[PDB]
Design an enzyme around this catalytic site. Sequence first.
Site, PDB file in Angstrom:
ATOM      1  N   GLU B  12       0.790  -1.242   0.000  1.00 60.07           N
ATOM      2  CA  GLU B  12       0.000   0.000   0.000  1.00 60.07           C
ATOM      3  C   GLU B  12       0.813   1.278   0.000  1.00 60.07           C
ATOM      4  O   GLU B  12       0.291   2.351  -0.351  1.00 60.07           O
ATOM      5  CB  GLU B  12      -0.965  -0.005   1.183  1.00 60.07           C
ATOM      6  N   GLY B  78     -12.409  -3.491   2.370  1.00 59.12           N
ATOM      7  CA  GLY B  78     -13.495  -4.410   2.005  1.00 59.12           C
ATOM      8  C   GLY B  78     -14.739  -3.574   1.762  1.00 59.12           C
ATOM      9  O   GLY B  78     -15.146  -2.782   2.621  1.00 59.12           O
ATOM     10  N   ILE B 152     -12.455  -9.485   7.453  1.00 63.25           N
ATOM     11  CA  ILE B 152     -13.844  -9.870   7.284  1.00 63.25           C
ATOM     12  C   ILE B 152     -13.995 -10.690   5.997  1.00 63.25           C
ATOM     13  O   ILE B 152     -13.572 -10.276   4.899  1.00 63.25           O
ATOM     14  CB  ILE B 152     -14.770  -8.647   7.237  1.00 63.25           C
ATOM     15  N   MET B 173      -9.054  -2.136   8.960  1.00 67.56           N
ATOM     16  CA  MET B 173      -8.478  -2.550  10.234  1.00 67.56           C
ATOM     17  C   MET B 173      -7.640  -1.478  10.934  1.00 67.56           C
ATOM     18  O   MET B 173      -7.082  -1.741  12.002  1.00 67.56           O
ATOM     19  CB  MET B 173      -7.659  -3.831  10.039  1.00 67.56           C
ATOM     20  N   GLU B 174      -7.565  -0.273  10.355  1.00 65.76           N
ATOM     21  CA  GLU B 174      -6.677   0.763  10.881  1.00 65.76           C
ATOM     22  C   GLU B 174      -7.289   2.144  11.005  1.00 65.76           C
ATOM     23  O   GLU B 174      -6.912   2.886  11.879  1.00 65.76           O
ATOM     24  CB  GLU B 174      -5.411   0.881  10.035  1.00 65.76           C
ATOM     25  N   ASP B 197     -11.909  -6.123  -2.314  1.00 62.23           N
ATOM     26  CA  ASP B 197     -12.798  -7.258  -2.048  1.00 62.23           C
ATOM     27  C   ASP B 197     -14.109  -6.738  -1.443  1.00 62.23           C
ATOM     28  O   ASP B 197     -14.241  -5.554  -1.144  1.00 62.23           O
ATOM     29  CB  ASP B 197     -12.166  -8.249  -1.091  1.00 62.23           C
TER      30      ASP B 197
HETATM   31  C1  LIG Z   1      -0.882 -10.231   5.332  1.00 69.43           C
HETATM   32  C2  LIG Z   1      -2.286 -10.665   4.999  1.00 69.43           C
HETATM   33  C3  LIG Z   1      -3.262  -9.990   5.960  1.00 69.43           C
HETATM   34  C4  LIG Z   1      -3.941  -8.754   5.383  1.00 69.43           C
HETATM   35  S1  LIG Z   1      -5.139  -8.223   6.562  1.00 69.43           S
HETATM   36  C5  LIG Z   1      -6.057  -7.061   5.637  1.00 69.43           C
HETATM   37  C6  LIG Z   1      -5.251  -5.751   5.499  1.00 69.43           C
HETATM   38  C7  LIG Z   1      -5.891  -4.917   4.393  1.00 69.43           C
HETATM   39  N1  LIG Z   1      -6.591  -3.810   5.098  1.00 69.43           N
HETATM   40  C8  LIG Z   1      -7.859  -3.364   4.491  1.00 69.43           C
HETATM   41  C9  LIG Z   1      -8.867  -4.435   4.085  1.00 69.43           C
HETATM   42  C10 LIG Z   1      -9.205  -4.851   2.793  1.00 69.43           C
HETATM   43  N2  LIG Z   1     -10.211  -5.795   2.820  1.00 69.43           N
HETATM   44  C11 LIG Z   1     -10.589  -6.046   4.077  1.00 69.43           C
HETATM   45  C12 LIG Z   1     -11.563  -6.904   4.761  1.00 69.43           C
HETATM   46  N3  LIG Z   1     -12.381  -7.755   4.060  1.00 69.43           N
HETATM   47  N4  LIG Z   1     -11.597  -6.831   6.112  1.00 69.43           N
HETATM   48  C13 LIG Z   1     -10.815  -6.018   6.841  1.00 69.43           C
HETATM   49  N5  LIG Z   1      -9.906  -5.208   6.297  1.00 69.43           N
HETATM   50  C14 LIG Z   1      -9.780  -5.196   4.950  1.00 69.43           C
HETATM   51  C15 LIG Z   1      -6.706  -4.187   6.521  1.00 69.43           C
HETATM   52  C16 LIG Z   1      -5.361  -4.866   6.731  1.00 69.43           C
HETATM   53  O1  LIG Z   1      -4.304  -3.861   6.759  1.00 69.43           O
END
Ligand SMILES: CCCCSC[C@H]1CN(Cc2c[nH]c3c(N)ncnc23)C[C@@H]1O
Lengths: 230, 230
Positions: B12, B78, B152, B173-174, B197
């Site tokens: 990002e 998301g 999620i 998440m932030e 997503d």
């Molecule tokens: C190393 C693999 C783990 C990645 S965890 C997800 C990342 C992307 N960020 C945003 C994000 C996009 N889609 C989402 C969803 N469905 N739920 C919650 N957060 C999101 C939050 C976090 O910094």
Amino acid sequence: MKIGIIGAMEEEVTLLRDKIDNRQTITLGGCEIYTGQLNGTEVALLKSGIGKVAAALGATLLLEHCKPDVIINTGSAGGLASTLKVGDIVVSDETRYHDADVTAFGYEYGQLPGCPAGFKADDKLIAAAESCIRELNLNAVRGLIVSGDAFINGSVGLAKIRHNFPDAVAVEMEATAIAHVCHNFNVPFVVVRAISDVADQQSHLSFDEFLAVAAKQSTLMVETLVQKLA
Amino acid sequence: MKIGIIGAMEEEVTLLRDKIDNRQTITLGGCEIYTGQLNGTEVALLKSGIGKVAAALGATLLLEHCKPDVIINTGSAGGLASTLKVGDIVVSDETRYHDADVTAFGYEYGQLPGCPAGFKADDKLIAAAESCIRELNLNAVRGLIVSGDAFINGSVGLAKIRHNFPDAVAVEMEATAIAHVCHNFNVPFVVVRAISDVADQQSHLSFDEFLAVAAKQSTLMVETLVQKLA
Ligand SMILES: CCCCSC[C@H]1CN(Cc2c[nH]c3c(N)ncnc23)C[C@@H]1O
Ligand SMILES: CCCCSC[C@H]1CN(Cc2c[nH]c3c(N)ncnc23)C[C@@H]1O
């Protein structure tokens, strides 16, 4: 030897605050720090506010502005282990987030990416606290403490925690965030809290009633612990 | 005027990072800050790591070490609103925690004690973002963004969010942790993210597939917005 102490609430820090000599205050980032000598020991006492972000913000400010050698997280907690009664002490050997879930990417439940699954509390700080428990003859349980941004009062909230963390001895809302910050700056950390409620049985009412007892017991512990480290 | 920018992941921040002139790197607390000029404008870009505490820690260090005048939180999200496709932009009018629960003491769901129930993003920042959205002819939605420490992926998590925050347009998440820190230091704040997503049972796969598209779209928006503010 500067000792950092963090509690979330006014009620949890007030007794320790009153006992600081040459007390000066820093109000910054919506938190308060109190600096001075506690039984002739240099301490920095932070009142962070409630929850994970407040504690992380507070912990960061404390570490940046006061450069403490260690951090002790004091205050109340919800008891999960059956031996625990209101007033008893809990000491962290480990902290974990009970509400963190990136399992869709193969992390362990509770684990955030870039973090360990749980954060180990400092063995010297734990030893010191166990000696303080023997000196004062307090009842105490040492174990995993879990944190989340939820106040736990039975039902499915408590069941989820007992299912995911069967060995957790207490639940609260800041300790793992402080641990996470301390981990990132390699600062020794330990939680020394006291039980205000059993995270069930109308815990909100127990909390109103027994927070003062929990503040007094953790305060006693912390004072003694600080003395024993100096 | 110095613009702070915060992203959680390497993927990002990497494109913006590569555009900074006179770049310096500060590595501290498991977080990295890159300072310099973006097309002439002073910026400081934080790679925070993932989740609420990581973001709180990093925003706190960013505000203390760089004192930016505004903070833009960028990255992926998301998508929850109907009119949102992978690649589309979401802009915060407000942020709330979806996983905070101190309702036992009478707080609104998602509210932490001592905080407002939601954090209002800055109206001048929102206006600028929207001007950029039009200029670039993108599809965007402005509204409530919710944060929590969970990725999620349908099931209970999605259900719970749609029930508790039917007006939320996106989840991540932030952002709310950053808004919370900004609230405490009175720094204007906006979220400008892109959809990777739709937070359903296939979100983990779609995230892996479309993170790069979301990073590019948020990067284009943030670069444009930075110059508009300049
Ligand atoms: C190393 C693999 C783990 C990645 S965890 C997800 C990342 C992307 N960020 C945003 C994000 C996009 N889609 C989402 C969803 N469905 N739920 C919650 N957060 C999101 C939050 C976090 O910094
Ligand atoms: C009156 C205003 C609202 C109080 S929110 C509760 C305080 C006390 N802290 C520890 C704590 C004791 N019991 C608990 C329980 N059952 N669940 C989760 N945390 C706890 C966490 C937080 O800082």
